[PDB]
Each structure stands twice: as C-alpha cells, then as structure tokens.
Amino acid sequence: SNRWNLGYGIPHKQVKLPNGQLCKEPGDSCSKRDECCKADDQKTYSSGCAQTWSAMEGGFVRECYICAVESSMC
C-alpha cells in the first residue's frame, strides 16, 4: 500500500470546505467520503475515501486515494 497507490505524489490543490474543516489527506483516516477532495486533474484522476483493511491500524478505516480512471495500470 505504497503512497503512490493513494496518488499522494500527484500534485493536488488544497481548499476549504463548507463544513468548516479542511480536505482530507491521502492515506489518513477520514470521516466521510465528502471529506475527500479532488486532485488537480480530477477529470482524469478519481478521488475518494473508502474503508480499507489496514494492518497498521488493525481495523477497516476510510482512507483517501487518488488514481487514474483511464489508466487502469495505475
């Protein structure tokens, strides 16, 4: 589960949410899918925060991820 998997390397643009809190980072636990922001090229890369078996955390937790929609290889 390298950082690349969460598209962390990819350059993203941070922004303030209407909820009052800031967007969620890739790899870190989130509160809701809506918390997950979009990448610079959301049109090509799909962003989202869903539960994922974490060996370190020891429990299903929603972690942000960013990958290419057309580029399945990603």
The CA distance from 69 to 66, in Å, is 9
60 neighbors 73 (Cβ within 8 angstroms): no
Method: NMR
DSSP 19: T
Q: Are 36 and 24 contacting, i.e. CB atoms less than 8 angstroms apart? A: yes
Q: Phi first, then psi: what are they for 5, rounded to 5°?
A: -60, -35
Rounded distance, CA 27 to CA 47, Å? 12
71-74 contacts, C-beta under 8 A, 24 or more apart: 71/44, 74/7
- Going 8 to 13 to 18 to 20, the CA torsion angle's sign is positive
What residues does each domain of the chain span?
1-74
